Design a protein around this ligand. Sequence first.
Ligand SMILES: *[C@@](O)(c1noc(CN2CCN(C(=O)CCCc3ccccc3)CC2)n1)[C@H](CCCCN)NC(=O)OCc1ccccc1
Ligand SMILES: *[C@@](O)(c1noc(CN2CCN(C(=O)CCCc3ccccc3)CC2)n1)[C@H](CCCCN)NC(=O)OCc1ccccc1
Ligand SMILES: *[C@@](O)(c1noc(CN2CCN(C(=O)CCCc3ccccc3)CC2)n1)[C@H](CCCCN)NC(=O)OCc1ccccc1
Ligand SMILES: *[C@@](O)(c1noc(CN2CCN(C(=O)CCCc3ccccc3)CC2)n1)[C@H](CCCCN)NC(=O)OCc1ccccc1
Lengths: 243, 243, 243, 243
Amino acid sequence: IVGGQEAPRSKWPWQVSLRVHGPYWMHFCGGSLIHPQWVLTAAHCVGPDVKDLAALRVQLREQHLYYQDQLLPVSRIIVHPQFYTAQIGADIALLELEEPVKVSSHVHTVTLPPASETFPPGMPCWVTGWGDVDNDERLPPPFPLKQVKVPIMENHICDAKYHLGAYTGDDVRIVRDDMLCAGNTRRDSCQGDSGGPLVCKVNGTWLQAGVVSWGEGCAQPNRPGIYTRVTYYLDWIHHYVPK
Amino acid sequence: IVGGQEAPRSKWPWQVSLRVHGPYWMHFCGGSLIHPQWVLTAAHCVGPDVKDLAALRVQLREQHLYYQDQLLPVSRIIVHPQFYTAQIGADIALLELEEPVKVSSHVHTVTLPPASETFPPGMPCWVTGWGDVDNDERLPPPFPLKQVKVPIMENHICDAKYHLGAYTGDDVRIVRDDMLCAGNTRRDSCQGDSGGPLVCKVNGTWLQAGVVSWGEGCAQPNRPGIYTRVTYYLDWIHHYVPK
Amino acid sequence: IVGGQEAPRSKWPWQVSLRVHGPYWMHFCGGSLIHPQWVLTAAHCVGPDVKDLAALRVQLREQHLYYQDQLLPVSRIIVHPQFYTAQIGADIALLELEEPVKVSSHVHTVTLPPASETFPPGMPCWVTGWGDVDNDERLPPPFPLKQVKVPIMENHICDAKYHLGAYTGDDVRIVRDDMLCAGNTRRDSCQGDSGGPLVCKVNGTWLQAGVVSWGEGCAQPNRPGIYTRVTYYLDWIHHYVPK
Amino acid sequence: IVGGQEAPRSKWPWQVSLRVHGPYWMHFCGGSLIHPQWVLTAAHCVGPDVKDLAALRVQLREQHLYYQDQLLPVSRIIVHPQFYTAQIGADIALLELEEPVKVSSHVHTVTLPPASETFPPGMPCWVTGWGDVDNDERLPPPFPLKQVKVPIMENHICDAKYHLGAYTGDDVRIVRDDMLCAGNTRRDSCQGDSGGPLVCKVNGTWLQAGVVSWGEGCAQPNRPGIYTRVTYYLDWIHHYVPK
Ligand SMILES: *[C@@](O)(c1noc(CN2CCN(C(=O)CCCc3ccccc3)CC2)n1)[C@H](CCCCN)NC(=O)OCc1ccccc1
Ligand SMILES: *[C@@](O)(c1noc(CN2CCN(C(=O)CCCc3ccccc3)CC2)n1)[C@H](CCCCN)NC(=O)OCc1ccccc1
Ligand SMILES: *[C@@](O)(c1noc(CN2CCN(C(=O)CCCc3ccccc3)CC2)n1)[C@H](CCCCN)NC(=O)OCc1ccccc1
Ligand SMILES: *[C@@](O)(c1noc(CN2CCN(C(=O)CCCc3ccccc3)CC2)n1)[C@H](CCCCN)NC(=O)OCc1ccccc1
């Protein structure tokens, strides 16, 4: 998270951390609990290639990474079939926990948006995670969960910015329709935040608008962060996650 | 280059080395002289973001990189307007040298394939370069130009391979039509070879069938090297390169 | 610490961590509280070149590094005047805190041994710290304080071991008289433990016999850990530290 | 070598490169040919621990590292029995080749100085090698042999400087008698040059005054380079190398 602040313990009850087996269960991506038994994340975090489930674990909200670990095993990894790379699209996936989780005010699910939600510019949205605080700058220990308010912009505006300083032809779509963009040169998500949630409060209810996907670097000029647009894959999600 | 060996001094007179300005003019990509004043290379080697010409130089046929350097300045970088990332496609670019080169028996152009030429799956082809000799392991000094015979494979059979051990839906194209693939678990091109040439001797004449583009790792199981199919962009090339 | 395990939080109340100013207050060495206002450590941790006090901080007994930080400023750094390199000797220093600490059962001083104490070979002693768990192997987060029981070795025997597999003449002293040594191929102190304490329980009382100094790798055959013999510099310590 | 230039082919015929077996025969130290079958180098380059002679080879003068390798095997490695660390002293060693080499104008031995040679300040000398061109700055390919004229200064002068900005007592000698000192903030030898030679033209004849040994960094303020004083170990050398 670029330009944020440590998040209060009472916020982002849905934030999760994905861990891969190694010298220690290291965090590689974020995600979000959307159901007692399901975690939503980015497909590039766990695919496109099939991985060994055993070498994967999920950590529920933690104020500081690695501090109070209580790792949960994963029974299933479900990656959107249309995915291959984040730039192309469909950067979304689901993780089924081996056992349901017990929710509480400190740990519970995030609300998914109705298929019609647009999240127009000027909407209050936040992104969270344990990613780098800047390009090539990792979050230093004790690794606090960070949060930053990001400005949402229209897809066509970001698409135009990505073409500035690029050879890519103006009519060749970069920021696609199943994507959503936010952030600026002071506020953005970064490496390590992938898979994490981008949420906005709409009428007193927090809705996950996106999943941290990609971007050219972090908080760089004319290169706002790109997120997978959740409303675009609601149907797919519901083919696995009950209402 | 993985699984090959040092190229005889008289082979591959078209191989070129791309250099970027730093503590020393370091190699970052390969290329091929397709005209006295034009170098064909991979777009991802010099884009999508605009580069500074001042920082680029071209080095012609060299037995050992950095040894007998005679850097040539570039006048213009033409990156196919449809290019954004290698996986998407149109990974091809042109480099117009500031002066034509005096071709010789030891250093001269390679012949482009005719628009109808269709390198049959199995064709004896060769790829060359100074790229890694294996995944994550560089070419050791004195950096000799390497070569390796690789078998060309049918696009469909390749696309199918890339889906093996992957979540990507079978009907979702990974190896696209403007691409070509070649190599196996023992022979392939690697990081450092990008933009380099994949040449095949057909009817007693060397034709450049492709440009080293991308691939999952090097010489990995069911992950053959992907190259930008040259025949596919012949018209775009000829829009700039004479005859 | 190689071998051994995480330390119960009621053990080693004198262990401290030295921090240096950077992106965060990073641990670079260990130490021990030998007086409410004095920390005993290794000279090579803070010299031979003069350092900037502003960039130094001391952290008292922590179960997991960086998690419950309460950095204490340092008012003086006294490096033994005879010190230049660890292999030469006199690898010992004193840090004078800016304020005495409120000792408790959880955090309090360790006892220096009497000038007579010798600590016989094959003595039950323990060394503690956050150093590497093995050669080139960092202590993984959450960075628990580790401990390991190591056997004291007679100086002559150590010096002798260090000559095995070496060109150094047998009569040339490697492990000097102001040094002490302990450990084996399974248990030892490692990079990051320097300045740390080596305590032994004598007559039912914990005394600091050594300060982690140097060694050839960690837990390597015929290469036991070398420590600055404390009894050898008691006089120097007591010139500054109240009896 | 810091602050020099590429050496002409006709100079430093005695310069040698030591190679360690690995992915390729990598340079790790310099040396000098003092006899058709003997090479003089630094003890810290090959000791204090005994090494596998098989994993070692010597390369005679080369204009560019790795390009014209003609590696020579070593039969014996003789290290001064007084050696343990460079700061302590006796940083000298001998390498006996398996076969005598053929001498010529391009490659021949260097003359050792008479026991009474002092090499007083003022008198210009040169140091050569393939080491770093600055602190943490590697010699770039094609790795040319560099040379640089260094100013020699009296031992007590350099010792005083080594004490500036250091806690080491002024009477604890740093630059020892068996050592020699040269270089300044713009001219010096650096990592990789170790074991190489420091030669001075005396009476029309070139004499090796020292062997690159150590220094705090390279070309740093009040930290001139330190070399092993050859005249101090003549007797030892002659116990092995014919007169
Ligand atoms: C993300 O935060 C981010 N950071 O790193 C990544 C890439 N990701 C690739 C897949 N990973 C692994 O190889 C290990 C798999 C562990 C595992 C084992 C067993 C089962 C399941 C899993 C983990 C690392 N992604 C950034 C966010 C950008 C924010 C900009 N505003 N995204 C990113 O870097 O994207 C592009 C990308 C994609 C793939 C590789 C490199 C770069
Ligand atoms: C290639 O060998 C390869 N290796 O690295 C690359 C990526 N390339 C990106 C563009 N580069 C730069 O940003 C620096 C530009 C310097 C410059 C300055 C001024 C003017 C002009 C230039 C250089 C590095 N490509 C591999 C070969 C695959 C072999 C498989 N069998 N290709 C590859 O990695 O492709 C996919 C890809 C595409 C873009 C980025 C990363 C990866
Ligand atoms: C020690 O654990 C150890 N680990 O690292 C070291 C070396 N030490 C050098 C001095 N340091 C710094 O440069 C930073 C100074 C920060 C500072 C700023 C401002 C004020 C005060 C301080 C810190 C790192 N020492 C091992 C233990 C060996 C155990 C074997 N069983 N010892 C070691 O490595 O010793 C030899 C040595 C000495 C100096 C350098 C390298 C190696
Ligand atoms: C020297 O140029 C220098 N450069 O590197 C070194 C250290 N040396 C350590 C031992 N080496 C090896 O591990 C490989 C052994 C190969 C081998 C195989 C088989 C048989 C025999 C040998 C080689 C590298 N020393 C500098 C000169 C400084 C000049 C300043 N004006 N000296 C230096 O760096 O010294 C301190 C030092 C010592 C050991 C490690 C790091 C630093």
